[PDB]
Design a protein around this ligand. Sequence first.
Ligand SMILES: [Mg+2]
Ligand SMILES: [Mg+2]
Lengths: 254, 107, 219, 507, 51, 390, 219, 107
Amino acid sequence: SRRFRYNTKFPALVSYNKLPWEVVNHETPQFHMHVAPHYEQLLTLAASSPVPHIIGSKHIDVPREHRLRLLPGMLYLLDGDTLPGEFTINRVLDPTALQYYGRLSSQIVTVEAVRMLVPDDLRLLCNCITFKGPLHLPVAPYASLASLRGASQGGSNCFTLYHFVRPNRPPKELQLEKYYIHAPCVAPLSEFASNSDERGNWRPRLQAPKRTRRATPLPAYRPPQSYLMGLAERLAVVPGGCFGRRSLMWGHWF
Amino acid sequence: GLNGCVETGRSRSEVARDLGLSYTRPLHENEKKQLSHQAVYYERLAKFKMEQPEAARAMERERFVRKFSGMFVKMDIRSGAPDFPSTYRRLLGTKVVRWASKRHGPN
Amino acid sequence: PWWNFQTEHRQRCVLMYGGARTKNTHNANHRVFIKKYKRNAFPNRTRHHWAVSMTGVLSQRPRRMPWPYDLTSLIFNQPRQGSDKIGYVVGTSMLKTAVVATNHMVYYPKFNQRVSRTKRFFAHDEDLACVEGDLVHIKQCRKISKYKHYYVFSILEPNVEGRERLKLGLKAVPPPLFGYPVSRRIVKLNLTSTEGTQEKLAAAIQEHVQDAYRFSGPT
Amino acid sequence: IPQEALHWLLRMIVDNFNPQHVHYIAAMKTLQSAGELDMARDVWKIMERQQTWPCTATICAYLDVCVEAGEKTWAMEAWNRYCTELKFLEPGEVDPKPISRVPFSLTREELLYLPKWKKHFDHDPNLDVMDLNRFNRTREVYLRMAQVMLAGGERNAFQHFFTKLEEAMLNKPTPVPEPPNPHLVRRPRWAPYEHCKSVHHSPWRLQNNGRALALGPPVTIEDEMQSRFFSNDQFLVHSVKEVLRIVLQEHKRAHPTECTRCKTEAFFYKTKDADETLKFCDDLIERLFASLGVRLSNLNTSSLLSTILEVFRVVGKESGAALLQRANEFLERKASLGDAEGSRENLTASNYLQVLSGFADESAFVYNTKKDGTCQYKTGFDPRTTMRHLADVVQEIAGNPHVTWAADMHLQVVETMVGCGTMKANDYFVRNVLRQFSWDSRFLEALYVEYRRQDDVDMWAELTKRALVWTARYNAPASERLRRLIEDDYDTIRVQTRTFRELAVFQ
Amino acid sequence: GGPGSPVRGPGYYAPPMEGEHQRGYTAEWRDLRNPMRPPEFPTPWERKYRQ
Amino acid sequence: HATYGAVPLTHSQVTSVYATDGGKVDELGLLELVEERIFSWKLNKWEMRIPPNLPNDQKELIRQEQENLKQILSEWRKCFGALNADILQISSLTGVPKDVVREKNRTWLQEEVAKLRWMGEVNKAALLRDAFMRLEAFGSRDFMFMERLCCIYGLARQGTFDEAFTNYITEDPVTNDIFVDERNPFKELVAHIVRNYSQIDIIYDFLGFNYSEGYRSSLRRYMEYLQCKTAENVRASGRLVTGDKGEHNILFDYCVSRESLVSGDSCQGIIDFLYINGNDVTLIIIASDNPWLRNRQLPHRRQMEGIARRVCFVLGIPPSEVRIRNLLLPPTYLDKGSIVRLNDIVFRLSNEQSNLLIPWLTNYNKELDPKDVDYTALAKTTNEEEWLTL
Amino acid sequence: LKAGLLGHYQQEAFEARKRFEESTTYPGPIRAATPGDTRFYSGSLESILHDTDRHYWRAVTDDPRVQHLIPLRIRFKIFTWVTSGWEQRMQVVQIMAPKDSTIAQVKDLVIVENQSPYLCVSSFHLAIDGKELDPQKTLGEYGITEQSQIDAIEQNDHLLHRDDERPRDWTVDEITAEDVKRSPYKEMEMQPLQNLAPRYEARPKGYFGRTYYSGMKQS
Amino acid sequence: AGKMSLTLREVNTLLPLLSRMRRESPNGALDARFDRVFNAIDTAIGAAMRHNCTLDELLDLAEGLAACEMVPSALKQVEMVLIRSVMMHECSPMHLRRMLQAMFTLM
RNA sequence: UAAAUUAUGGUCAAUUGUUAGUAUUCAUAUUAAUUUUUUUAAAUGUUUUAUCAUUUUAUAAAGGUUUAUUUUUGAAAGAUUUUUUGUAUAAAAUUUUAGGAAUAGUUAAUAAUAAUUUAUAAUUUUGAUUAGAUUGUUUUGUUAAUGCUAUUAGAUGGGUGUGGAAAAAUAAAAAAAA
Ligand SMILES: [Mg+2]
Ligand SMILES: [Mg+2]
């Protein structure tokens, strides 16, 4: 019969695209939590190795019928703050949403403006971030960002990132995992190469110096005076509640 | 194609299927009607779902409400039993009045 | 000394439950049967209970037991009891389902004899090759339908006459003229004309009224 | 423990099952992967005592074990028992054989008149030997037999096997490769519950996800196909590569103190039997270049070049610049025999790994010698020239975007900057390897020496403690060698490197 | 005895059997009550324990 | 092993494939070397030797023939092991060198047994005497020599055993050089067997090794070979061989008695060969495997008188001197006594002139199997009958 | 059925067999057909998550999974950075293409098996010695062998929009992994399983304790 | 694998595609990959002869068997249902022309 | 209808208590008395926590009545790996009625989860359904007995969709995270 084809184990489940607690809304600061560490690792890649289609001369001109099909998941950098047409400009002024670009604005290019572009059909977002040059990271001459005027120079320095996403999807949609190639930075090794004049000025240390004095002792351990929560090595708490292993307890009160 | 395979455990029909042989008794007209009317109801029901959406949607919604709100929708050993009036036969007298009998087949 | 199997069973019961058995199980008690209904008015149509009926599936008298030594154990090496069976196809009225009558043996140690009982199974044939009269070899499988856990592994003997009758457009076997009755009342066949059915109906309803008059009893 | 791989075979026979050839292959591969070679030979003896004639894959799995063990007697016994009738493929024969054995079935007569022991079918592996020898794995038998005769020291039998293999790969067609069998696992068809944590689920470190590898690989792979999917000339190149690998294996077996990282003075210089070994390797390479003509321009020689570089790095003590020069000359020789203007290929990651390993072997040293704190280096070692030859090579690799870096590639750079005494390996480890790689603990086993050469003792102490916090944060536990390195300077640094639990157990 | 019992036949008399059960019940099954000979081993472990 | 496309060989492709030329090939040494290679095998070497793409009856006959070859080679392996054990036991109890044991004497045996009994060792003397007594009957180097040569010819006849005697890894016994030897002693030995023994297929079928078609065609070729060396002016048309001297030397292949004997029919007398030699007539019959058909296979006295009268009619030979005699042969093989009686009766040859014509007849040591009492009784009652005179 | 008539039937089962081997004539060895899959596995019902269309053990590999492949290596013009500037070099991508495939299928095989983010970035074109290849032609129509040098000329102004809806390991048996991450020609045949866990028997069948009398081996 | 079974419509759809793949091959015959395809057709024809069949499906089946040159294993029930179809009132001379051309291309 | 063959030239036995195991009392044995003994009166403290909450703590009885039975992937065991993934949901088989007859949320097919269709459907005189009695169990008793006679392991579709599993309104231990 129809009842005796398979068993009832592992039935069909409702997908996460139709559950509101699994779908990240773009009007919330949780949209910029998932998508901001993907930008700071892409700009680290684009400053160290040539990525093919991360920098264009214009916006990509797909037709209006193929706009929703081809554009989400695509990223490119342009020079200057020029926004695509048929979009409504919503500038992100929330400090709860702008705080997730803190590492991006400090250790890399300074974030000037973050804009969300919502179209007339309300189905294709575009996260526009305006950076102001120059980069705080050293840029390789063969890298992609060396082909950018705002990135190489130190209105003329501004360049914009464009990331197209769909509005109400689970946060696995707004992922950029094809840009996690870890290209090395040869800035500490450019000093000793043949292209540098500092190659004969450094002195090698082949042996350790003779230590007449031992290390400075730590100050005297004062035990705490407050009520502690208990032994963290059996409450399954990580060594400070932050990181480490529970089997290797360290950095707590004892 | 009259002998099953002892090694693979295939049936008498599957060995003849893998050899391209046809062993089928000459069917009567009702036995051909049983194998001929399987696609007719599918072509009827799919045409109904394409042609009358406002009625097929209401029928499917009422069927889903009747399925979802049922009391015995939890997959259990009671709901997973093949013959419920035969395995649980002491409930048919004093507890369950749906089945009036505990024997419906050869078991 | 060589201990019997009852020592091993007692050892199993001691290791499971901590003790073998609470003693004084017989108690020599007189089970008294008292009557409540009338003489011939027990509320059942077939079996009228008027004595102390013993309850038990294998603890009753005269004692039965399954007899595992038969034709199937002689032919097939089975991984478990009832895995392979050999029987005859008796019904193909359902699609992809052959009704197979098989036999087994039940042993009576008091009379020291084995008797063959018959069990009917529903087996599966996908290509519709089983005809009524085939000696088939069926095997256990998964649940296919509510009453289908066997399948036709091989046709050990095809009914040639049934297939040739199916080629003629006839039935595979001619249907029997006897069978199960519909009541204990003698089913009389009515041989009447078009005009004489009303008086036959009056006689039948008058006979039913006399059978209802039997409720009154005397006078 | 790996002994369970021998146990679950034995319980397979106690429970009255016939172990198939895949069970013996899996047991021998699992016991060879854990370094238990006598247990793998016991699996072979279990297979022989069950009177099972092995297929060519089981023969090759036994031959991998006895070329790793260096035992020629085992392979000669297996040869004289099974492989005396193996032939290569001929142009007249069909490339796959047809299935010979019809599956086991019984008629209506054989069900009755036969006894119950003839009607019984257990999955006996001796019935389908001719259907498992269907794909003609003769060349991987002959290559392993050429490996075991080179490992045992028999030059004439190795020459016979390699000459037969060379003539068969030059004059006979390529057999059809066996497709992989996916019915050996019970994996589900899809993920039953789709839920995937993000890469940045932890705010403290970058972690690997099941969807993508975001931390980068720890070990470089060759990125080549299996030995059965190769062509005949590609299998000849692979055969030369495997013979050089067995040369390297027997050289590491004969001189174990001169092939690991230093630990003694004898690592820096060549042994006496190295020059004839390099002469034999060069004769084999020139024999490969003389057999294959222009067709070697149309073959993948990356693993062969990496094996040539590790042979001319470990056996012959060559500099890293000499390894780069040999690799560039090899690629120019390969690009020049095409008789066109062409365009040369780049070195792969596995080719650059041996150049960086040669650079790390130049700057390598014997730590904590008899003079109590003086690292002994190679005679004639120049740190400036080695560092200048390392830096432009690293810039050459970083200029090529098609070379994917891994942790073992950065490890040789860190060990070279530690051994050259440039005091900049920690900054390279922070910028390139710390936050974006799954680094093992032995990185710090170089870097503590870079921590040891600091001016003040408090900088040494704080750098060691920060390295311990780095082991805590990025989920890279400290190895026994690093903890024993920090143990030896406890009178000076007073850094505790054992837990409060292990010491109370230890006493 | 059926489930979980090693008894295969009655002790003294039985209904008539055929085939391998006829050879088993009379000759080949176990019998520890035999005062002369123990239940015999499979071949060839019976020839060297004849005495 | 078995290859897809391998086929069993007849005698023509055996003498065509192994057609090489060799000079002064040692038969005993290469025989012992090939048998030493055979005895070093295991049973797993005998598994995959049947070619796959064949019908099931042909595969079953090939399996029966290969199992017969395997069991005869295993019996000779046990006999050779017992031989070497007895030779080692004699050379250990006596103290004589091992190479001179085979050339020792019975007076030497008496002296050694008396010396062992003089020292007080009657157990060792009885062991030496019993080992020498069972060594005189078995200790020759050519003991089952025709049987071993027919076994090796059958191993070549299967066609799947030729590659199993080479590609071994050996050591040099004097220098310890591990090498791979490509010398095939099986090919050289069977080439010498093919070149020297021109009737190796006849000895192969006569010993009961051929399970496919039997020894009947080999018997016909043997009889026409022995007729062409006695009549010396021989014509052969199909199934009829005739001498043209005027004296009747006729061999007629009548029919095959296996296919003609239909089970369940009443027809008395079906013969295989009919040989007219001068005034004598012989009905040469190969017996059947059915013991209920052997009583039907021999013709009646009236049928033999009719055959003799037909001979008197067609040949013009007077009925005063006409003699007809039945002859019965073993079904699956042909022992030595049947060939001796065949040369005595049907060709009128004694032992010495048949040994002059046939060299391999002296070393032919096949005898009747003791498991067949019905055939031995029927052949005793048949071959001891007088010539039926018309 | 009546078992006492079994052995006489066995005699007939001899005599029907030996006539059948003697009456008819076998024409030749019939070729072996590939066996399918049975839907009658024993035990309980399995799930659709583990339905892999194989319910028995077959240790051999049959003909539908066997492919005839050519190791085609295709070159790409790349640019590397040296101390001077850009230098043009060659990057080789090796695929196993079937012999009956077209050049568009070879291009799709290069696209799905490059696993490099810098090579197949725009619309490229396959060519041999500058002459471009027709993508609707077979490899045998051009005589392309393993030694044939094939180049891939890119047009970097475009952008290749691919849809990898076909899995990397797709054969006729429809068994593909979701975490496959590698072409099946590159992965090893046998490796250690790190996802599973070794489990021992924790449920004793009949023996539980003190003295092993019989062990309840019938159970 | 026994998961699905082909009726006559799937065979009448698959046979022109396989004939078109046969015409594009270098050899006249198809690859050895499709021997399991034709076998899946070969059991699908011999079962469908036991069911009811219209004239147009039999014509398309005969034209498909004539297009890609394949003789089915049954070959006799198909001729019986072609004998049962020639004297029908539905039969047209176009139908007889297709049937005779297909039987000449097969036989 | 074979017809009495002729050194009768070897007689001197048995018992030394050592055994291949259902053995029968129509009047004796099992039951209650001549004799029983000994107690028991409910109204009740499981514990950790981040505190008006959250983490661990899955087979009490009477009633109703059963042809049968077992094993969670999920929690734990359990480990410097990890996917709510580590094959649990099935089969054969054997009950009784002093006055013996009909039964059905029904059987199979199915592109059908959640059946608008098809069928000459399914059980039963080889004893069904219902009604009565009703846990079963070489465990008890008896005997020379393959005979007769007894039984107390258990389970539980509307109390809460929680939980891995409802077994959850009460159990002298199964010691329950220092
Ligand atoms: Mg767990
Ligand atoms: Mg229907």
